[PDB]
Amino acid sequence: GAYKYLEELQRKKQSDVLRFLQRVRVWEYRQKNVIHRAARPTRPDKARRLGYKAKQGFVIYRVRVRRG
């Protein structure tokens, strides 16, 4: 299934593809509020992994803390 291609993609974090995705999305996130509800996991292969089943009553939230 498609997940093993998400897992393996997600591990080439300096591949030119991801860098570009890393860029565009790290920009998108800054603009929305610091805690904002997530329409749907950016990483479906991973939210799956850590427990998330894509069903009612599961909730994914994105968040931004401050480094250092």
Partner: protein, 231 residues
């Protein structure tokens, strides 16, 4: 008529309160408007790697509408159809024999991303349509080249919303047929032939080219001006 006069307005600087023109350009739109507007825009400058620039290549209205009217002939079982088929098959076959094979071997469109993948993986599929708008894009980026290596004819179609209702859903991402009744295999070729000359033989050459740029309007005519004028 000469009892009405023709008193004309000036609307130049320093006189005549300006007339309600149109401000759609100058609207201070909601934040969530600009974000989606500016993410595409951002994704328009900066060079785009090819494996994402592979998309944008959608399809012509014609082969699209061709490949749809074809796929439309293989809808899944609807609710009340699987309903009665099971009141039919289950009730009688378990009151007799024919291991549930109380029904014709079906010919549906097949969908579900992991699923359509294991198809392509196993060389069981015949024509795969990948939507050009999935998010994240990684959900699909491997397909165009996963397809190519298995040699499974693919094509990057327009509408994750179309393929959806094409498989009786809100959205679908992928839709790909492996079977098809024998009365159709002829349109198969003429569709795969013309496609496999846009999404297949083109692949190798296409992945060698990135996208992005497009200074947008102002700064581009300004370089269209520095060039035209200063040369």
């Amino acid at each position: 008529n000469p009892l009405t006069h023709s008193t004309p307005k000036n609307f130049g600087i320093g006189q005549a309160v300006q007339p309600k023109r149109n401000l759609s350009r100058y609207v201070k739109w909601p934040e969530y408007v600009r974000v989606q507007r500016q993410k595409k825009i951002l994704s328009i400058r900066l060079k785009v790697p090819p494996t994402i620039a592979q998309f944008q290549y959608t399809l012509d209205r014609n082969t699209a509408a061709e490949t749809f009217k074809l796929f439309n002939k293989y809808r899944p079982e609807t609710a009340a159809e699987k309903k009665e088929r099971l009141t039919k098959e289950a009730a009688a076959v378990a009151e007799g024999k024919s291991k549930q094979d109380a029904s014709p071997k079906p010919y549906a469109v097949k969908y579900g991303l992991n699923h359509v993948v294991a198809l392509i993986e196993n060389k069981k599929a015949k024509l795969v349509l990948i939507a050009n708008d999935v998010d994240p894009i990684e959900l699909v980026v491997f397909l165009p080249a996963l397809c190519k290596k298995m040699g499974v004819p693919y094509a990057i179609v327009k509408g994750k919303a179309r393929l959806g209702t094409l498989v009786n859903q809100k959205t679908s991402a992928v839709a790909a047929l492996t079977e098809v009744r024998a009365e159709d295999e002829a349109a198969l070729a003429k569709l795969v032939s013309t496609i496999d000359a846009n999404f297949a033989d083109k692949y190798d050459e296409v992945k060698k080219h990135w996208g992005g740029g497009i200074l947008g309007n102002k700064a581009q005519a300004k370089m269209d001006k520095x060039x035209x004028x200063x040369x």
